[PDB]
């Protein structure tokens, strides 16, 4: 039911590039920011700003006039382990800005480094919502 | 952002809110969406409009009162119109219930679903999102609800969904406060509001360290979070001015002796400037001020000795005469002290003071009259009297450097009448005069007096000139008029006698 994704370059799934997840209606997605110990001098530390882009933004790694700002991995030294961000794959959202999800469609996510990549290659995640026939 | 102190906030939370939801699955969800600019918030959403029967609970963490009476809750929420969404009417709702429970236990494991106290069923006022299908626009509805009075240590908050599609954006938990203000020279501290919106708190604030409470200072703490019109005024202490709302010290060259509404007055004439925050401007060397004298008065000088002295002797008594002193200094209170020395008898300076009971008819010492009389004296003895000019400040000031004195003898007779008088130069405007010293002086001759009165005419005013020399003249006299003159000898002994009536007619 719940899907856990650790957002870091050290992860073997992200290194492939073709990292995709098959999700159903009313399912959850948990994104974990890269957590580092106090001994780290914050130089090797990774910090990313997440964006929800389209198919054009997925291949070109651009978020300007193509996507919207989602979450930010600003402080790596969080008290209760890594920073957790929740995303529900609901059909209808009660919140005014809250993102809706449709069955049998693809949704894309990208991340840009704060210090940087230089528009060469970005850490990307492909999200596909399975139709009503596939989900029970 | 406001002056109100916050207790619980969705923005201020360290990482996750961590709120207990009953049921856990299919209930309230911690779906977090970022708000502009760079602000992470924990958003609680629920949309179970389809299912027939709906019951939902969302309990907040421990909220401490921190000495508060009434707490104001501000909830930011997004809704969905039941007609705009497909489904049966009634299953979907547009209202949600709010609950609160008072507790003393810090970390409570579980709070009963029945023990909660309902506040109000909240709906989105004024407008609510449907939401519009064409374009997506954020809501601007924020609902406020008050809760009080509170008795226990703290409280817990809950939310109830009756089948609505609701998204709780931000939950602001604050309590209304009166600011720390210094009005009417008195300090007033930060105070909590009353148990009700009608309630007011009487705040009696203490005055500044360099001030004294003339009237009891008090104010009223309004429920809105603002101070009311002051009752009672405070005035700054002596040597401190009532400027800038806080007690300030008097500048270098300024003073304040009494706690009055007036500012620090400048140092009076001839007064030395003291340091910052002076009670009274100190008197510089050579100038002083009396203990019973006012602080506003300038520094006064001691008096000079009276310049002229006239002495007259009797068989057993003596009379002394003197005029006003040259320099008063400033003070009007001038008295005269008569001191007996008895140094006249004998040539050396070393002498014995007047130990015997010397009686005085006007006053012994501190005489306000310009004339003194000594009733008793010893015959054949040489005495010396010192007329001391005493001021009201002369005691506080150093003893006067000099005092005009005269050496006189009791037994010695007054000088006799002058033998002859002769006019040396007679003109139409001026008449010169020359005379001999009396046959029997009985002491050293000090002064000569000449009388001037009209003859063969009406009794005029007899003019008397004072000359130490035996030769004198007159300026401004009418021609062809007869005048009579009299020369009188004056010594330390006393009053002499009139001379030969010399009839001299103008040329």
Contact between A96 and B78 using a beta-carbon 8 Å cutoff: yes
Separation of alpha carbons B195 and B458, rounded Å? 106
CB nearest B131 (choices: A78, A84, A96): A96
Contact between B47 and A90 using a beta-carbon 8 Å cutoff: yes
Does A101 lie at the interface with B, CB-CB under 8 angstroms? no
Strands A123-129 and A20-23: parallel
Token reading at A9: 């370059």
Cα-flanking dihedrals φ and ψ of residue B96, to 5°?
-145, 140
Per the structure, the count of domains in chain B is: 5
CB nearest B167 (choices: A71, A87, A98): A98
Contact between A71 and B32 using a beta-carbon 8 Å cutoff: yes
Query: Looking at the structure, do residues B342 and B407 belong to the same domain, yes or no?
Result: yes
Q: How many CB atoms sit inside 10 A of residue B140's CB?
A: 11
* Binding-face residues of B in 154-183 toward A, CB within 8 A: 164-167, 169
Separation of alpha carbons B207 and B217, rounded Å? 8
Picking from B394, B416, B438, the residue at the C-terminal end of a domain is B416
Query: Looking at the structure, do residues B386 and B494 belong to the same domain, yes or no?
Result: no
Query: What domain range includes position B389?
Result: 300-416
Separation of alpha carbons B308 and B466, rounded Å? 12
* Binding-face residues of B in 24-83 toward A, CB within 8 A: 29-34, 36, 38, 40, 43, 45-47, 49, 78-80
Question: Taking CB atoms and an 8 Å cutoff, what residues of chain A touch B139?
Answer: 96
Contact between B80 and A99 using a beta-carbon 8 Å cutoff: no
Does A83 lie at the interface with B, CB-CB under 8 angstroms? yes
Query: Looking at the structure, do residues B465 and B322 belong to the same domain, yes or no?
Result: no
CB nearest A95 (choices: B34, B85, B167): B167
Contact between B165 and A94 using a beta-carbon 8 Å cutoff: yes
What is the residue whose two structure tokens read 């054009």? Answer: A56
Q: No. of H helices and E strands in chain A?
A: 2, 8
Distances (CA, A) of B136 to A95, A96, B44, B206: 11, 7, 20, 57
Picking from B389, B416, B443, the residue at the C-terminal end of a domain is B416
Query: Looking at the structure, do residues B80 and B194 belong to the same domain, yes or no?
Result: no
Specify the DSSP class assigned to residue A57: H
Of B26, B142, B15, B155, nearest to A90 by C-alpha is B26
CB nearest A84 (choices: B16, B46, B47): B16
Query: Looking at the structure, do residues B268 and B285 belong to the same domain, yes or no?
Result: yes
Query: Looking at the structure, do residues B309 and B288 belong to the same domain, yes or no?
Result: no
Picking from B352, B383, B416, the residue at the C-terminal end of a domain is B416
Domains of chain A, each with CATH number or no CATH:
1-136 (2.60.40.420)
Query: Looking at the structure, do residues B66 and B172 belong to the same domain, yes or no?
Result: yes
Token reading at A34: 């890269």
Query: Looking at the structure, do residues B216 and B147 belong to the same domain, yes or no?
Result: no
What is the residue whose two structure tokens read 């389809």? Answer: B50
Technique that determined the structure: X-ray
Of B251, B45, B279, B271, nearest to B167 by C-alpha is B45
Query: Looking at the structure, do residues B182 and B132 belong to the same domain, yes or no?
Result: no
* Binding-face residues of B in 364-383 toward A, CB within 8 A: none
Cα-flanking dihedrals φ and ψ of residue A58, to 5°?
-75, -40
């Amino acid at each position: 039911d719940r899907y856990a994704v650790y957002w870091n370059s050290s992860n073997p799934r992200f290194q492939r590039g073709d990292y995709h997840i098959d999700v159903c209606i009313n399912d959850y997605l948990d994104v974990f920011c890269p957590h580092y110990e106090d001994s780290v001098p914050e130089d090797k530390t990774e910090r990313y700003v997440l964006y929800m882009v389209n198919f054009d933004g997925y291949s070109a790694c651009d978020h300007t006039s193509k996507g919207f700002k989602r979450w930010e991995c600003n402080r790596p030294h969080s008290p209760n382990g890594p920073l957790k961000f929740s995303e529900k794959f609901q059909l209808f959202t009660p919140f005014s800005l809250g993102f809706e999800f449709r069955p049998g469609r693809e949704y894309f996510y990208i991340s840009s480094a704060i210090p940087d990549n230089g528009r060469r290659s970005c850490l990307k995640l492909k999200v596909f919502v399975r139709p009503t026939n596939s989900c029970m | 952002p406001a002056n109100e102190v916050t207790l619980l906030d969705s923005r201020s939370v360290q990482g996750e809110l961590g709120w207990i939801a009953s049921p856990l699955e299919g209930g309230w969800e911690e779906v977090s969406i970022m708000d502009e600019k760079n602000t992470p918030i924990r958003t609680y959403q629920v949309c179970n409009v389809m299912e027939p029967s709906q019951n939902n609970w969302l309990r907040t963490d421990w909220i401490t009162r921190e000495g508060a009476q009434r707490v104001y809750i501000e909830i930011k929420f997004t809704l969905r119109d039941c007609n705009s969404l497909p489904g049966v009417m009634g299953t979907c709702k547009e209202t949600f219930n709010l609950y609160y429970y008072e507790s003393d236990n810090d970390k409570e494991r579980f709070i009963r679903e029945n023990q909660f106290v309902k506040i109000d069923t909240i709906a989105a006022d004024e407008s609510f999102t449907q939401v519009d299908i064409g374009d997506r626009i954020m809501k601007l509805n924020t609902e406020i609800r008050d809760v009080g009075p509170l008795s226990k240590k703290g409280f817990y908050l809950a939310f109830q969904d009756v089948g609505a599609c609701i998204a709780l954006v931000s939950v602001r938990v604050f309590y209304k406060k009166c600011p720390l203000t210094v009005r009417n020279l008195a300090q007033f501290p930060d105070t909590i509001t009353g148990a009700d919106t009608s309630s007011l708190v009487e705040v009696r604030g203490s005055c500044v360290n360099n001030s004294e409470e003339k009237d009891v200072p008090k104010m009223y703490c309004g429920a809105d979070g603002e101070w009311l019109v002051p009752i009672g005024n405070c005035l700054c202490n002596a040597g401190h001015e009532e400027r800038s709302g806080e007690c300030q010290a008097c500048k270098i060259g300024y003073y304040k002796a009494l706690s009055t509404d007036a500012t620090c007055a400048k140092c009076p004439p001839h007064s030395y400037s003291v340091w910052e925050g002076a009670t009274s401007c100190t008197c510089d060397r050579g100038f002083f001020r009396a203990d019973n004298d006012a602080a506003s008065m300038p520094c006064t000088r001691p008096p000079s000795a009276p310049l002229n002295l006239i002495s007259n002797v009797n068989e057993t008594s003596v009379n002394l005469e003197w005029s006003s002193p040259q320099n008063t200094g400033g003070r009007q209170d001038i008295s005269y002290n008569v001191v007996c020395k008895k140094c006249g008898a004998g040539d050396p300076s070393k002498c014995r003071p007047c130990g015997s009971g010397v009686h005085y008819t006007p006053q012994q010492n501190g005489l306000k009259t310009t004339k003194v009389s000594i009733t008793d004296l010893l015959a054949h003895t040489n005495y010396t009297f010192e007329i001391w000019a005493v001021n009201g400040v002369s005691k506080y000031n150093p003893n006067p450097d000099q005092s005009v004195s005269v050496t006189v003898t009791t037994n010695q007779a007054a000088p006799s009448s002058i033998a002859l008088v002769q006019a040396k130069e007679v003109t139409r405007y001026s008449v010169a005069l020359a005379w001999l010293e009396p046959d029997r002086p009985n002491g050293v001759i000090l002064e000569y007096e000449v009388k001037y009165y009209e003859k063969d005419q009406n009794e005029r005013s007899y003019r008397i000139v004072r000359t130490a020399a035996r030769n004198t003249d007159i300026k401004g006299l009418n021609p062809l008029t007869s005048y009579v003159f009299h020369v009188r000898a004056r010594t330390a002994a006393g009053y002499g006698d009139f001379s030969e009536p010399l009839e001299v007619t103008t040329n």
